[PDB]
Design a protein around this ligand. Structure first.
Ligand SMILES: *[C@@H]1O[C@H](CO)[C@@H](O)[C@H](O)[C@H]1NC(C)=O
Lengths: 46, 50
């Protein structure tokens, strides 16, 4: 049982800037006071 | 024996002062333009930083 939604007012897709967001720990290992380089699926800055 | 005349001799000597400055790109020398190879080169990055 489902019903469509009719009162719709849509606009073009707004865009905004990702200010250095979307970084995750690449592994389950504790690292402290270190500069670590990793290549992976990351959200590019800005 | 005492000299009674002289000559003014001009001697040329050459000395190398510098050599051609050079720079090397690890990534495009070792792993030419392939991403698969360049990913494997990250763990050796320290060596290139040397
Ligand atoms: C409206 O709802 C029905 C089923 O509930 C669905 O088949 C239909 O695709 C919906 N209308 C549109 C434009 O998708």
């Amino acid at each position: 049982q489902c019903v469509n939604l009719t009162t719709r007012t849509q606009l073009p897709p707004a865009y905004t800037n990702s200010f250095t967001r979307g970084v995750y720990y690449p592994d389950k290992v504790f690292r402290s006071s270190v500069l670590h380089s990793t290549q992976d699926l990351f959200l590019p800055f800005f | 024996a005492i000299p009674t005349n002289f000559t003014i001799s001009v001697t040329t000597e050459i000395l190398p002062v510098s050599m051609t400055k050079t720079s090397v790109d690890c990534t495009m020398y070792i792993c030419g333009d392939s991403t698969e190879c360049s990913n494997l080169l990250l763990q050796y990055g320290s060596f290139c930083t040397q």
